[PDB]
Amino acid sequence: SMEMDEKDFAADSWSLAVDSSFLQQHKKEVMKQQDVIYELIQTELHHVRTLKIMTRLFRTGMLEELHLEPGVVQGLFPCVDELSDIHTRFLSQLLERRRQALCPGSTRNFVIHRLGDLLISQFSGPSAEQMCKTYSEFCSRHSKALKLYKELYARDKRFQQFIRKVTRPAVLKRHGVQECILLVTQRITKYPLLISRILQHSHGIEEERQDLTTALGLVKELLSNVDEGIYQLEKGARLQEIYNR
Amino acid sequence: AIRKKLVIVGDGACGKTCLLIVFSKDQFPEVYVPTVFENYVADIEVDGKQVELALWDTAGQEDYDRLRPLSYPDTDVILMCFSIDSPDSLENIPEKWTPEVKHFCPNVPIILVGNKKDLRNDEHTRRELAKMKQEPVKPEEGRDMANRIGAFGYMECSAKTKDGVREVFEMATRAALQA
Numbered sequence: 001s002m003e004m005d006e007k008d009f010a011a012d013s014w015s016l017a018v019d020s021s022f023l024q025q026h027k028k029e030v031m032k033q034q035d036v037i038y039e040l041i042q043t044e045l046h047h048v049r050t051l052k053i054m055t056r057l058f059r060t061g062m063l064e065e066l067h068l069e070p071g072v073v074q075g076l077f078p079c080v081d082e083l084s085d086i087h088t089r090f091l092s093q094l095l096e097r098r099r100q101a102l103c104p105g106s107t108r109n110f111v112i113h114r115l116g117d118l119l120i121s122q123f124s125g126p127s128a129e130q131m132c133k134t135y136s137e138f139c140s141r142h143s144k145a146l147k148l149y150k151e152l153y154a155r156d157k158r159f160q161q162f163i164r165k166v167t168r169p170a171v172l173k174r175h176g177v178q179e180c181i182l183l184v185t186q187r188i189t190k191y192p193l194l195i196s197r198i199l200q201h202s203h204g205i206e207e208e209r210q211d212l213t214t215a216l217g218l219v220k221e222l223l224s225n226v227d228e229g230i231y232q233l234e235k236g237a238r239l240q241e242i243y244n245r
Numbered sequence: 246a247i248r249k250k251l252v253i254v255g256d257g258a259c260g261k262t263c264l265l266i267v268f269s270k271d272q273f274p275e276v277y278v279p280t281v282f283e284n285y286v287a288d289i290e291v292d293g294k295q296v297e298l299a300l301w302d303t304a305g306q307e308d309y310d311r312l313r314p315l316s317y318p319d320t321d322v323i324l325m326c327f328s329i330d331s332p333d334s335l336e337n338i339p340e341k342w343t344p345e346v347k348h349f350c351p352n353v354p355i356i357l358v359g360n361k362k363d364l365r366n367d368e369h370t371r372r373e374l375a376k377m378k379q380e381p382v383k384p385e386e387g388r389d390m391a392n393r394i395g396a397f398g399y400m401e402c403s404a405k406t407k408d409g410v411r412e413v414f415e416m417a418t419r420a421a422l423q424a
């Protein structure tokens with residue numbers, strides 16, 4: 001992540017990120033809504049950072065340093081460029097909504113009142129079709145990526161040295177290869193929990209309550225479609241094992 | 246320090262996310278309680294052995310039967326949670342959660358954990374449950390469920406007060422280290 005955004009989301013909550021004199025100007029229900037919207041954006045910033053560790057530190061480091069057989073890097077990191085494009089674009093829209101809402105003279109005091117429309121746009125139309133296609137593919141290749149990683153780590157010395165080298169820094173403690181894969185698979189099922197809690201604190205403007213209700217239903221439709229579209233791929237599974245599913 | 250993986254499973258109202266948050270911070274949040282938990286790697290020393298224990302939540306996956314099992318590969322210990330303020334959450338343990346965890350995590354130790362133990366003697370909780378002809382889960386009911394399901398053990402805790410939380414994760418570490 002870039003330093004400007006990391007500092008903007010360093011605090012544990014929106015109520016601790018804004019100036020105390022600005023926090024005092026709002027009602028408790030607004031503070032509760034803004035705290036959950038801040039957690040959605042903060043966790044999205046961290047998710048895009050997970051994807052950059054996968055594309056830049058791991059995938060590109062393996063291509064530029066190791067001599068793995070063709071098709072192996074794509075097997076370890078399926079769909080990572082498509083996932084990075086989806087979420088960097090979504091993060092850009094969330095951060096632009098925050099930046100437009102800043103008070104003149106401040107780089108920290110803002111309130112986002114219209115998130116629902118941005119979530120309906122993200123979870124409908126061509127962007128929802130791309131998220132469905134990409135997660136259906138990624139989640140069906142999740143077991144295969146973990147198995148390929150374990151095999152290379154146990155048998156290839158240069159691969160093991162590379163992984164121990166780039167994962168040694170304390171900032172990578174939670175972000176080994178297998179950990180990144182499961183953080184990405186689990187991201188999509190965090191959205192309903194976050195949206196439902198923002199909706200609980202968004203009743204003050206009826207158009208906003210209606211838009212977040214529409215967004216929650218669109219996210220659950222996407223998750224149901226991804227879940228129905230998954231079948232784990234397995235290296236060496238024969239056609240007979242597949243048609244006897 | 247050897248690395249081990251822990252996954253917590255249970256119904257949406259079992260308190261699993263709050264349990265992971267409180268353990269990972271050694272604090273019940275004073276300003277904001279997070280909605281979600283990403284992951285965490287705890288440094289734990291139990292009985293003289295140092296472990297890095299990776300922690301994972303299954304919250305949000307309860308309705309998605311093909312996404313949820315992607316959380317299970319290479320798990321070393323399962324925390325199977327229910328809330329003491331919810332006999333319904335305990336009823337879903339033996340024939341929903343247990344057969345799934347035994348299928349995807351064969352031979353992995355399960356610790357059955359009763360969460361929200363501070364609510365066992367809470368008057369508001371007792372009044373609400375009595376309307377459905379219910380009462381908070383008794384400790385013998387938790388132990389008998391653990392015994393029935395083949396759990397490694399039964400433990401109780403309160404994420405609100407932190408009582409029992411350190412003990413649950415130290416025991417999960419010990420279970421993860423066993424042959």
Ligand SMILES: CCC(=O)Nc1c(C(N)=O)oc2ccccc12
Nearest residue numbers: 309310311313314344345346348
């Ligand atoms: C389709 C393969 C399969 O049998 N999956 C199982 C699932 C699941 N969530 O896919 O949960 C289970 C609980 C007990 C036995 C089996 C399964």
Ligand SMILES: CCC(=O)Nc1c(C(N)=O)oc2ccccc12
Nearest residue numbers: 385386388389390391392393394
């Ligand atoms: C009080 C007994 C009870 O409710 N359930 C038990 C079952 C079962 N299959 O219902 O199996 C057990 C094994 C040890 C302790 C308890 C039980």
